[PDB]
Amino acid sequence: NMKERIHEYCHRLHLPVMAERWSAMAEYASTHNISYSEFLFRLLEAEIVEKQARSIQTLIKLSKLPYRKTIDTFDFTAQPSVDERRIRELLTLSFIDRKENILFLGPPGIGKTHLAISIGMEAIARGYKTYFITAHDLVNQLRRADQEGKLEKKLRVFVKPTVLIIDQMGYLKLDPNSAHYLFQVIARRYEHAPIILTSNKSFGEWGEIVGDSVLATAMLDRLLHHSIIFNLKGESYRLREKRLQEE
Amino acid sequence: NMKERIHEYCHRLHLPVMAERWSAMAEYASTHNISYSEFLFRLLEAEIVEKQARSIQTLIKLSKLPYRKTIDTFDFTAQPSVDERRIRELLTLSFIDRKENILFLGPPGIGKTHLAISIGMEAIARGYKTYFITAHDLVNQLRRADQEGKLEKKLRVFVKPTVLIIDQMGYLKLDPNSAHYLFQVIARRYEHAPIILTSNKSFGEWGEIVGDSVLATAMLDRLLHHSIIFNLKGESYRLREKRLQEE
DNA sequence: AGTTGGCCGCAGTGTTATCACTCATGGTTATGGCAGCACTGCATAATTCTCTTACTGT
Ligand SMILES: Nc1ncnc2c1ncn2[C@@H]1O[C@H](COP(=O)(O)OP(=O)(O)OP(=O)(O)O)[C@@H](O)[C@H]1O
Ligand SMILES: Nc1ncnc2c1ncn2[C@@H]1O[C@H](COP(=O)(O)OP(=O)(O)O)[C@@H](O)[C@H]1O
Ligand SMILES: [Mg+2]
Numbered sequence: 001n002m003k004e005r006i007h008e009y010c011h012r013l014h015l016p017v018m019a020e021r022w023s024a025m026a027e028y029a030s031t032h033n034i035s036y037s038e039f040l041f042r043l044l045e046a047e048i049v050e051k052q053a054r055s056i057q058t059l060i061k062l063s064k065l066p067y068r069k070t071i072d073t074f075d076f077t078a079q080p081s082v083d084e085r086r087i088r089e090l091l092t093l094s095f096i097d098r099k100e101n102i103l104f105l106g107p108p109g110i111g112k113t114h115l116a117i118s119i120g121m122e123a124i125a126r127g128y129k130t131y132f133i134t135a136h137d138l139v140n141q142l143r144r145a146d147q148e149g150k151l152e153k154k155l156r157v158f159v160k161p162t163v164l165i166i167d168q169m170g171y172l173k174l175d176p177n178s179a180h181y182l183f184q185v186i187a188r189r190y191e192h193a194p195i196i197l198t199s200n201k202s203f204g205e206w207g208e209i210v211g212d213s214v215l216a217t218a219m220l221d222r223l224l225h226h227s228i229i230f231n232l233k234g235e236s237y238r239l240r241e242k243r244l245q246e247e
Numbered sequence: 248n249m250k251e252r253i254h255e256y257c258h259r260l261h262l263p264v265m266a267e268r269w270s271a272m273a274e275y276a277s278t279h280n281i282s283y284s285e286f287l288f289r290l291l292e293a294e295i296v297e298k299q300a301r302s303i304q305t306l307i308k309l310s311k312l313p314y315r316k317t318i319d320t321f322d323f324t325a326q327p328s329v330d331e332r333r334i335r336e337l338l339t340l341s342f343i344d345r346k347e348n349i350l351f352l353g354p355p356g357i358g359k360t361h362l363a364i365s366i367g368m369e370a371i372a373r374g375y376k377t378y379f380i381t382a383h384d385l386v387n388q389l390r391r392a393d394q395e396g397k398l399e400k401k402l403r404v405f406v407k408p409t410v411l412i413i414d415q416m417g418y419l420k421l422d423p424n425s426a427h428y429l430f431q432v433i434a435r436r437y438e439h440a441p442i443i444l445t446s447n448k449s450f451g452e453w454g455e456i457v458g459d460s461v462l463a464t465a466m467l468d469r470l471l472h473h474s475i476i477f478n479l480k481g482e483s484y485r486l487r488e489k490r491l492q493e494e
Numbered sequence: 495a496g497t498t499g500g501c502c503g504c505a506g507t508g509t510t511a512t513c514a515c516t517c518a519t520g521g522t523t524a525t526g527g528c529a530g531c532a533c534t535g536c537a538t539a540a541t542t543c544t545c546t547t548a549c550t551g552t
C-alpha cells in the first residue's frame with residue numbers, strides 16, 4: 001500500500017515522530033484544508049522539537065552537572081546580597097560572546113554552585129556544550145592522563161566544552177604538580193571559551209592553595225583578564241533550611 | 248533412587264535447608280492435603296528466610312562494629328533529657344529515605360556509641376549495609392590510601408555503605424592536613440546516604456580538632472543541613488549512675 | 495695410488511689521485527589519508543558474596 005512505505009521511509013530517514021505527528025497533521029489539514037507548505041512546516045517543526053528535546057537530554061547527560069536545577073527554583077529574597085540584574089544578564093549568555101570568566105566567591109551555603117549549575121543548564125539548553133568538574137577531580141584525572149601518556153586527550157576533553165565549570169576550588173589543597181596541571185587547562189582556555197568557577201577563598205590564598213605564589217599569580221591573571229566576579233555574602237541556606245524545618 | 252537424587256540436586260542448586268526439610272514438608276502436606284503450589288511456596292519461603300538470616304549474619308560481620316548492642320538494653324529513665332519517642336521513630340529507619348544525618352552529642356560514657364550501634368543494627372537487620380569507623384581512623388586509612396595512590400577505592404568503600412557510623416570524632420587529632428579526607432567523605436555522602444555521628448565535643452571545637460576553621464565550617468554546614476541532632480545531658484552511666492542510685 | 499703441503503702463478507685488495515653521478519634542499523601546487531566526533535557492543539577487570547582456611551595458645 002502507501003502508508004507502510006511512508007512509515008518505512010520516515011524511519012529510514014530517522015523521522016518517526018514526524019511520521020506520527022504527520023498523520024495527525026494530515027487529519028488536521030483534511031479538517032481545515034491546510035496548505036501543503038504549512039503542513040510540512042508542522043511536520044518538520046515538531047520533529048525539531050522532539051529531536052532538540054532528546055538532544056538536550058543527552059547533552060545534559062554528557063555534561064557532569066550534578067543536577068538539573070533552573071533559576072526558577074531559586075529565590076533572591078532569601079539572598080539580599082545578590083542582584084537579579086547581573087544574574088539574568090549572565091543568563092543572556094553575553095559572556096560566551098565576550099569570553100568572560102565568571103567567578104563566584106563567598107562562604108559556604110550561599111548558593112553560588114546553584115547559580116553556576118543553573119547557568120550551565122541554560123548553556124546546555126541553548127545547544128552550547130557544557131562540562132562540569134571539580135578542581136580536585138580535574139587535577140586527579142589530568143595527573144592520571146599524564147601518567148598514561150594520554151594527557152592531550154584529557155586536555156582536549158576539558159578544553160573542547162564551550163562552557164567549562166570548575167567547582168569546589170579551595171576547600172581541598174593542591175600540590176605544585178596539581179598547580180601546573182590546572183595551569184595547563186587555564187592556558188588552553190585563556191581566550192578560547194569562558195570558564196565558570198566557584199570558590200570560598202580570596203585570590204591571595206590561592207598561593208597557599210596551589211603551593212606556588214607565581215603559578216597562582218599567573219593563573220589569576222589569565223582567569224581575571226576577562227572576568228566578572230560575584231563576591232556574595234549571607235547566611236548559609238543549609239542552616240536556614242534546617243532552622244525552618246526545626247520550626 | 249529418587250531421595251538421593253533429590254538431595255544431590257538440592258545441593259547442586261544451593262538449597263541446603265530445602266534438602267534437609269523436603270521430606271518433612273512433603274509429609275506435612277500429605278497429612279493436610281496441602282496444594283502443590285502451597286508446598287512449593289513453603290519450601291521456597293523457608294529457604295528464603297534462612298538465606299536472609301545468613302545474609303544478615305554476613306552484613307553484621309562486615310559492619311566492623313566493636314560489639315553488638317540494641318535498644319533493648321537501654322534505659323531511657325537514666326536519660327530523661329531527650330525524648331524517647333524520637334529514638335523509637337528513628338528505629339523505623341525513615342531517615343534512610345530522607346538521607347538525614349543522626350548526631351549524638353554528650354559527655355563521655357553517656358551511651359552515645361550504644362545508641363549509634365543499636366540504630367546501625369536495626370539498619371543491618373532490614374538489609375541495608377552499614378560500616379562502623381572512628382573518624383580519626385577513617386582519616387588515617389584515607390591518608391594511607393592516598394599515599395599509595397589508590398584513594399578512590401577506599402573512598403568508594405566509605406561512601407557506598409547506606410549507613411556510616413563515624414564515632415570518636417574528637418578522641419584523637421591527626422595532622423590537620425588530613426582533614427580534607429573527612430571533608431571528602433562527608434561531601435561525597437552528602438544528599439546521598441545518612442551518616443551516624445557520635446562525639447563529646449561541641450560544634451565549635453571542630454576547627455581546633457581538624458586544625459582548620461573554614462574546612463570544619465563547611466563540613467558542619469553539609470553534615471547539619473539534613474540531620475536530627477540529639478544532645479544528651481547527664482553523667483557517665485557506668486560510674487555516676489550506679490553511685491547515685493545505690494544510695 | 496691418494497692426500498696434503500709447498501711453490502708458483504694469478505687475482506684481488508688497498509691507497510692516492512682524479513672524475514662523474516646522485517642525492518638533498520628549497521619553493522610551489524595538488525591530492526589523499528588520517529583524525530575527530532558520535533553511537534554501540536564486547537570483554538576484561540574489579541567488586542561483591544559466600545565458604546573455607548589459617549594462626550596461635552591453652
Ligand atoms: N537563596 C536561595 N534560595 C533557594 N535555595 C538556595 C538559596 N541559596 C542557597 N540555596 C540552596 O542551597 C543549596 C546549596 O547551594 P550551593 O551548593 O550553591 O552552595 P555553596 O555556597 O556554593 O556551597 P559550598 O561552598 O559548600 O560549595 C542548594 O540546594 C541551593 O538550592
Ligand atoms: N542509658 C544507658 N543505658 C544502658 N547502658 C548504658 C547507658 N549509657 C551507657 N551505658 C553503658 O555504657 C557503655 C556505653 O558508653 P559509650 O556511650 O560508648 O561512651 P563513649 O561514647 O564515651 O564511648 C555501654 O557498655 C553501655 O552498656
Ligand atoms: Mg557548592
